[model samples]
Target: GAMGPQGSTQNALRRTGRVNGGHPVTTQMVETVQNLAPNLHPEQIRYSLENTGSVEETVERYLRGDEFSFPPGFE
Candidate 1:
């Protein structure tokens, strides 16, 4: 299947960080969490994804009010 517009959008929106277990976190994964919690910044999603390495885990934590350190230099 050819990549769609949304696919390109995801590619453009990738996290600027190293991969976890050889898999760099994708924007789609972060967006999945953002869809439920729209108030969060992309850095927050990226940090959670980098640490937890799971969409559900990040979303669960955010939904439940669990705190995690925000990215340094976030503005």
Candidate 2:
């Protein structure tokens, strides 16, 4: 068997983050959630928080729990 001429591996990696409309979940969204607390259960909430791509949601979740709060004036 032979691999056909296709897109680069980098392209495949980038596409993994794209939604149905072909818009990518931004780096900020991905990284922000990565820094969030792992105490929360269910992979969906974490994925949603990250995939939602909203800084407000990220900040809100962090503030809601002592385990996830930021330093003073972090807002």
Candidate 3:
């Protein structure tokens, strides 16, 4: 996979609930993502949220494989 400038993608991976740029990864969010995909790890779910900034988008990306890893079943 072609990664953006060295760590450019990592620039915004920080999570803060105050909304400086995105919401913090909460238990609710992790649970919600897990509910949709029980195969995913808590770390993976939080990583998705860090990038997506929202639970809805995180779930959407995971389901579509847009910016997420393929489901284990696919491998």
Candidate 4:
């Protein structure tokens, strides 16, 4: 695996949400992310929301069982 920054094209590893510069990561968003991937920090949820562009789709992808490993195994 290539070592790099969060969500790097080489590793796709974003240890936290609140991505570099995106959504504010509100408690609502965090809660939303939690529904899908339980066991992630506020920043991690923000990262998903920020990347997905909204808590709605972020959760959609998570439930769809995307590669994200916060909780994984969601179907």
Top candidate (lDDT): 1
Better of 1 and 3 by lDDT: 1
**lDDT tens per residue, model 3, 1-75:** 877655445566567766444456778888898899776776677767866778898888778866564423444
* Per-residue C-alpha lDDT of model 1 across residues 17-38, encoded as one tens digit per residue: 8655423588888899889778
RMSD to the hidden true structure, all candidates: 12.3, 12.5, 15.0, 14.7
lDDT of 3 at 32: 93
- Which whole-number lDDT from 0 to 100 does residue 9 have in model 1? 42
When 1 and 2 are scored with TM-score, the better candidate is: 1
After superposition, the stretches of candidate 4 with alpha carbons farther than 4 Å from their true spots are 1-24, 39-42, 69-75
In angstroms, give how far residue 25 of model 1 lies from its true place: 0.8
Question: Can you write out model 2's per-residue Cα lDDT over 3-51, one digit (the tens) per residue?
Answer: 8888666644444654643223455654555556454433333344444
Best by TM-score: 1
TM-score pick, better of 2 and 4: 4
TM-score, structure 1 vs. true? 0.60
Q: Rank the candidate models, highest lDDT first.
A: 1, 3, 4, 2
The C-alpha local distance difference test score for the whole of candidate 4 amounts to: 0.64
Off by over 4 Å in 3: 1-22, 69-75
Stretches of candidate 1 exceeding 4 Å from the true structure: 1-23, 72-75
